[PDB]
Amino acid sequence: DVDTYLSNLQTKTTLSMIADGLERSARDFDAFLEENVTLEWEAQRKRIYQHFG
């Protein structure tokens, strides 16, 4: 385990890698909003399908 950990290690500050979580969140939020608005359009269409009958 330690062998692979040292093999795949990069010379750089650790506090910068964890920071990437912010970027990843900012890039996931977009897709999450797109899923919100798609499940919303879906819901709306559904309620219309239950309005017409």
Q: Which two tokens stand for residue 41?
A: 């359009």
* Residue 15 interacting with other proteins (CB under 8 A): yes
**One residue of 3, 23, 50, 51 binding other proteins per CB under 8 A:** 51
Q: Which two tokens stand for residue 7?
A: 């093999």
What is the Cα–Cα distance from 7 to 5, expressed in whole angstroms? 5
**One residue of 23, 27, 50, 53 binding other proteins per CB under 8 A:** 27
CB of 28: closest distance to other proteins in angstroms? 5
CB of 18: closest distance to other proteins in angstroms? 5
Dmax over Cα atoms in the chain, in whole Å? 65
